Each structure stands twice: as structure tokens, then as C-alpha cells.
Write a protein that binds this ligand. Structure first.
Ligand SMILES: [Zn+2]
Lengths: 123, 72
């Protein structure tokens, strides 16, 4: 694994974007993630709602799901693919996603290297 | 025949505007001190919404919004 840990979520969410396996928004995340048809879940750390931590921490706790946390809703908004771009490629518009739920992974040696390494070391 | 204007009637029939509930998704689950999950409402037996969707508690009834199931 030549990759850094923090930059490698990009391939997981890109291939989860291509295979139509991503669920964004808290309800469509939580609900479908509680259906046990979804493997892993990506969350944001910084938030203005205290209960928003409780919900998905408890959900990820009981339902045997793994918890990743990112910096702001904005960077996660850049990962999810909701960023609208300018003429020259400027990421101008950002719709932030705190909740991300992964259902169908793609097949990648990179993002799975970093995520499996990080989660083998976390356990 | 020049078309008559003639607009008069019960002055306005207003179209329903969406009721915006702020963070209403959080109301469903009850989190205790241990981090346990307590579901305050009932699960729906139907196939499509099974295990992923819950029902509503109205005083006399239970209502799911997907398949429109109803109980007393
Ligand atoms: Zn139903």
C-alpha cells in the first residue's frame, strides 16, 4: 500500500458512485444501512447537531458496521460527487454530505488496500 | 368570436405547500446512556419497505408511507 490513509476514500466512493451503490442523506443512509444490505458507512465529525452523532454511532455500533469520520461536510461533499464545476474545472459549488452509506463496492486494489489496512489496524 | 375573459369564482383554491420538518429523521430512534437503540414505532410487514422503513403512530392507527398500509 503506497497510498496515504486520508486520500484513499476517493476510489471507494468513486466506484461506489459508478456502480450506483451510494446512499446519501441521513434517512436514506440510516434506513438502508439498517437493512443489513450495506457493508460500510462514512460520516462527518464536525456537526451542529449533537444527536446526529448519537444516531449513527449507535446504529454503527449495534448493526456491526464500521465507522469512518471526516473533517467537514464540505470535503465529504467533494467526495460524494455533488460538487458542480466551472468552465475551467473549478470546484465552485459544494453540497455537503455528512452521511454516506456504501452498498455496492467496486473492485479496486487501492482503496481496499488502505481501508482494509486501516480497519485491520483499528480492530 | 372574440374570447371572453370572465375570470371569477371562489377567489382562491390554494395548492398544498410541503410541510418542512427540520431534522425529523432523528425523532424515530431513542438513544439511552449506554448507546442502545430503542425503536419507538412499529415495523412494516410489507416486502418492499421491509426492515428498512417504519410506520406511523396516529392515535387510532398505524400508517406506512410507502405501501400505504393501515392498522387500528
Ligand atoms: Zn409498508
Amino acid at each position: 500500500g503506497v497510498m496515504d490513509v486520508n486520500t484513499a476514500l476517493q476510489e471507494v466512493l468513486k466506484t461506489a458512485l459508478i456502480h450506483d451503490g451510494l446512499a446519501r442523506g441521513i434517512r436514506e443512509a440510516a434506513k438502508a444501512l439498517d437493512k443489513r444490505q450495506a457493508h460500510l458507512c462514512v460520516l462527518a465529525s464536525n456537526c451542529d447537531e449533537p444527536m446526529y452523532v448519537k444516531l449513527v454511532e449507535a446504529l454503527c455500533a449495534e448493526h456491526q458496521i464500521n465507522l469512518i469520520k471526516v473533517d467537514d461536510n464540505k470535503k465529504l461533499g467533494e467526495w460524494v460527487g455533488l460538487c458542480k464545476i466551472d468552465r475551467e474545472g473549478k470546484p465552485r459549488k459544494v453540497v455537503g454530505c455528512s452521511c454516506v452509506v456504501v452498498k455496492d463496492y467496486g473492485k479496486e486494489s487501492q482503496a481496499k488496500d488502505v481501508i482494509e489496512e486501516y480497519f485491520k489496524c483499528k480492530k | 368570436k372574440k374570447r371572453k375573459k370572465k375570470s371569477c369564482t371562489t377567489p382562491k383554491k390554494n395548492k398544498h405547500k410541503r410541510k418542512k420538518v427540520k431534522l425529523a429523521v432523528l425523532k424515530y430512534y431513542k438513544v439511552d446512556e449506554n448507546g442502545k437503540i430503542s425503536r419507538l414505532r412499529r415495523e412494516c410487514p410489507s416486502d418492499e419497505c421491509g426492515a428498512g422503513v417504519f410506520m406511523a403512530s396516529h392515535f387510532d392507527r398505524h400508517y406506512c408511507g410507502k405501501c400505504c398500509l393501515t392498522y387500528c
